[PDB]
Amino acid sequence: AEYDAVWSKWERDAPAGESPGRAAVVQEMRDCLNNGNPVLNVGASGLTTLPDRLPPHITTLVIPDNNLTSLPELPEGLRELEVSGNLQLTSLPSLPQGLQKLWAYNNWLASLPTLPPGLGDLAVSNNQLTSLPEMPPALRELRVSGNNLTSLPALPSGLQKLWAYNNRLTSLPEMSPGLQELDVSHNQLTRLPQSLTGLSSAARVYLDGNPLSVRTLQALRDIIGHSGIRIHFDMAGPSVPREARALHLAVADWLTSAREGEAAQADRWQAFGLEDNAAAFSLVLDRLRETENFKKDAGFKAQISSWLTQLAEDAALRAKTFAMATEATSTCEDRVTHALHQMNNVQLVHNAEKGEYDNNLQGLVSTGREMFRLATLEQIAREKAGTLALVDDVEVYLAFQNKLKESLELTSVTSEMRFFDVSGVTVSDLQAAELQVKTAENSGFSKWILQWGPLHSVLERKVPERFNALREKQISDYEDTYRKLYDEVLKSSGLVDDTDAERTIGVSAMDSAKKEFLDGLRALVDEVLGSYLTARWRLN
């Protein structure tokens, strides 16, 4: 019929040397069209062009070792597509809904079409893939090894085996409970999800070749020794310390927006990368960026990216921020959350110094409470971090912010993810953290705000005369107390001649002044912002 005419010109248009192979395929296609052959296997004829039309009935198509650059629109009846050896094939056509097996290996695919809901076997290994489409519910085998993937999409519950060898994965999604084999060997994974512990006792997990953190390695040893799960990883391999990237490279991966000045700002960070402690700051950016939170919520980028802008304009702030990052890198991890908060505080202190809160004392308290809530969540995050073998402080803390943003009025949190579940953190944990945060805020926010850094900056700007009076009084109270205590030792005929005794008396005198100063600041805070320090949450 009409299909025969299309095949005729395809063979006739074949370049020299291809017509013999092209003609041979036509006979197989004609065989399918006449006697309804369900399988069409194009021979390894080196054909570079495929006919625009093919037998619609065929449910199986195989195209091995051909110099193809594109594929014709597939028939709806296909359930098995196998394309291999087409090193010039960089994309596949629209996948039919009824397709069940998709084998595209030893190709140069850079993108993958929308996966049909019925696909169960996907093999796209040895390709140029950088991102995977959403996995079909019926998928049970996923061959994605030998690609440039950095993230894995949501894994269906029915997935049985997954191979991701020699990829660039930096974070792993929560794993399916019924996963027999999981090969993420030789990737850029620094930590693993807690769902790994939920696999079957006989499951084979291959994690060798990844820059797994020392804490993660210790967790795997305990996991294998207590649950009997077959986990293969590097134990006797030397522990590799993290190598910091150039600061501008790390910042560039955050400033990915199309704003006018984002790209130009990133280039400035080349010079900043030579500043002291830049390596520690670079590591912090990569630690936060290589997370499922970053991969799933663009709001995470909007927060860190805007924060970098202020650091680019304030040298003093940027240097102090870098010094904060040294804490996270001094130990291998688990100090990142504390460093991040101290980076926000220094940022707020400079914002207070700039005078943002000079006429927004109500906003200052609101920011203070929010920082107190975030500070409390840090401690709660650490507590759950120890309980969870494969989860650290950062991942737990991010989950608390995302779920408790509305519960605790955390306006600072730009991430709004409700379907993002971090295994190991149950609803009972969130409610306890939500209750504990509210309990602490009502009980001791007034004490907390006294030592808050931004409050001192704002007080120095809007109540300087009274603020400096307290500071001057502390000097006078210390001097008077020192002379008072100095004489008391003299009456006891104690040691006052030696310098150390004078120093020890000074600390006693200095402590007394600090107690006097703290009480004075408490009264001043109540006078200025006392009305804003009332209990926020109605509790039981």
Side-chain angles (χ1 to χ4, degrees), residues 219-418:
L220 291 180
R221 283 182 278 264
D222 297 357
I223 292 184
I224 60 180
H226 289 43
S227 298
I229 176 57
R230 298 179 180 179
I231 293 181
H232 311 85
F233 67 101
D234 49 321
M235 305 181 61
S239 300
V240 179
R242 295 180 176 179
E243 191 63 50
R245 315 160 58 190
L247 182 54
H248 67 270
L249 297 180
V251 176
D253 292 336
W254 285 90
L255 302 174
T256 76
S257 185
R259 297 180 177 271
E260 282 197 3
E262 285 206 356
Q265 174 200 1
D267 300 327
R268 293 183 55 188
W269 287 88
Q270 305 180 22
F272 299 153
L274 300 174
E275 300 174 355
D276 302 70
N277 298 326
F281 190 82
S282 178
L283 299 176
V284 179
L285 300 177
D286 297 324
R287 170 71 169 90
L288 304 173
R289 185 183 51 85
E290 301 165 9
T291 64
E292 285 287 312
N293 305 75
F294 175 91
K295 299 182 174 63
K296 287 184 146 300
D297 179 69
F300 197 13
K301 178 194 63 175
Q303 173 191 347
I304 297 299
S305 58
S306 61
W307 165 50
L308 299 178
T309 309
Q310 295 185 351
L311 296 179
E313 297 181 348
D314 188 327
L317 171 63
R318 186 175 60 260
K320 285 191 293 181
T321 297
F322 291 2
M324 310 294 181
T326 65
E327 198 195 42
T329 74
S330 289
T331 70
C332 257
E333 64 243 52
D334 248 68
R335 293 269 73 189
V336 192
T337 56
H338 190 206
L340 295 177
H341 290 168
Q342 296 206 349
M343 296 180 179
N344 285 267
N345 288 333
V346 67
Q347 178 186 14
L348 295 177
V349 172
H350 279 260
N351 279 22
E353 297 180 3
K354 294 172 57 182
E356 285 205 359
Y357 301 102
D358 291 359
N359 283 282
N360 197 14
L361 303 179
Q362 180 186 71
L364 177 66
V365 173
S366 302
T367 303
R369 296 182 177 272
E370 191 153 314
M371 292 302 151
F372 173 90
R373 289 191 280 264
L374 295 183
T376 294
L377 285 176
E378 170 198 355
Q379 178 61 10
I380 301 179
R382 266 194 297 273
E383 308 295 25
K384 246 300 180 179
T387 295
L388 303 179
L390 297 181
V391 190
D392 287 14
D393 61 335
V394 174
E395 287 68 14
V396 176
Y397 176 75
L398 301 176
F400 286 164
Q401 287 186 158
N402 191 31
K403 304 283 132 173
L404 297 180
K405 175 181 179 179
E406 298 298 340
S407 302
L408 299 177
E409 293 188 5
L410 302 173
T411 70
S412 59
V413 182
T414 59
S415 301
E416 299 173 301
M417 308 175 290
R418 294 181 178 179

Side-chain angles (χ1 to χ4, degrees), residues 431-499:
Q431 299 174 358
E434 174 183 355
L435 194 289
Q436 178 168 309
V437 168
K438 299 187 176 184
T439 303
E441 182 175 354
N442 296 343
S443 60
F445 173 74
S446 299
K447 283 277 188 59
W448 179 85
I449 195 176
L450 294 188
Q451 294 81 25
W452 193 31
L455 185 62
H456 289 241
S457 296
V458 180
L459 297 191
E460 298 182 6
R461 300 181 62 84
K462 207 172 188 182
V463 296
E465 189 272 341
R466 301 132 81 185
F467 196 84
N468 287 269
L470 286 166
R471 310 166 95 172
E472 177 182 346
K473 184 206 170 189
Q474 186 178 4
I475 303 180
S476 302
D477 285 54
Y478 159 76
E479 298 187 7
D480 299 330
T481 304
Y482 172 83
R483 298 180 179 179
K484 154 194 174 63
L485 304 184
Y486 192 99
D487 296 359
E488 298 183 0
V489 185
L490 285 175
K491 293 309 306 299
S492 177
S493 295
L495 184 63
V496 297
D497 300 328
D498 190 55
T499 43

